[PDB]
Amino acid sequence: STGSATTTPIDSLDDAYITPVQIGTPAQTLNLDFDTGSSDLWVFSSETTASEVDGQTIYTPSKSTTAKLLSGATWSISYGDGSSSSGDVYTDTVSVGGLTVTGQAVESAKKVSSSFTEDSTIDGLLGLAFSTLNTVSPTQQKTFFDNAKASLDSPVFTADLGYHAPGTYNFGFIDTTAYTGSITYTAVSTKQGFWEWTSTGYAVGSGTFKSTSIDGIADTGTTLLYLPATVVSAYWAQVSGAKSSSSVGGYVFPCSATLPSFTFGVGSARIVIPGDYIDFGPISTGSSSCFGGIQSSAGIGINIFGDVALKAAFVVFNGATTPTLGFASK
DSSP: OOEEEEEEESSTTOOOEEEEEEETTTTEEEEEEEETTOOOEEEOBTTSOGGGOSSOOOBOGGGOTTOEEEEEEEEEEEOTTSOEEEEEEEEEEEEETTEEEEEEEEEEEEEEOHHHHTOTTOOEEEEOSOGGGOOOBSSOOOOHHHHHGGGSSSSEEEEEOOSSSOEEEEESOOOTTSSSSOOEEEEOBOTTSSOEEEEEEEEETTSOOEEEEEEEEEOTTOOSEEEOHHHHHHHHTTSTTOEEETTTTEEEEETTOOOOOEEEEETTEEEEEOGGGGEEEESSTTOSEEEESEEEOTTTSSEEEOHHHHTTSEEEEEOSSSOEEEEEOO
């Protein structure tokens, strides 16, 4: 089997991407944030504290003839950005782009933190990291991909995120029309539960490539590119007037700037992030200070190849017995 679904930016900055997901019988379609940095499929629901719902579409398990309470199971998750959610668990039929999993754990939120409430466009998350990170207790549950994998034509999924435009998540096949050149594959460590890999270096603009190992995670659920402070300083030094602002929470730059590109290495291959992908717009409405899309990972504890990086590539998440990651230009 295979599946193919379009993923759409939630706003004009590509702050996140939403993908429609069918849950239950008859189908209830929710728009979920596919997150290769976590491993829980959770949704706003009829159980979510009413004051914490503001415009989201909810899953109502009592209206699904295939929903079953997973008795005694609870979940609770906290994300790197400080947001969180928790609740109980149902199993139900879940379909993405025509690919169906029966008995998928659907984690129903009883509580969500303010940032989730405040984002009316995201109805929940669909985790695509390794199932070892799943938070369900006392019986850990499998991700949608883990459940689907054996049925897929090939044990892979691909992320093809757009810059200020829709893109695609495919399951079970590699669309050879969706990228240019060849796909370069690179090793993955699953020891921390992530799609963790090592970039071979970077360049800023038309500058020379610096060969240096940068361990980090391929994370579709993180907006920006978080790299070591040395790398980030080297980038922003090429932008007149850019500075790190403790009050704003990162590097800012004059909105009048033309940003240089940023290149990262995948083995001997190179992925180029155009400068415009690094512009996250005014820090507040009407400001002439703009927020940067490359930020320091210092104090996160891990480097994160988030959407800023991934949207410059066609990315293969290869879930073979020994997982790997592939990157192609597009």
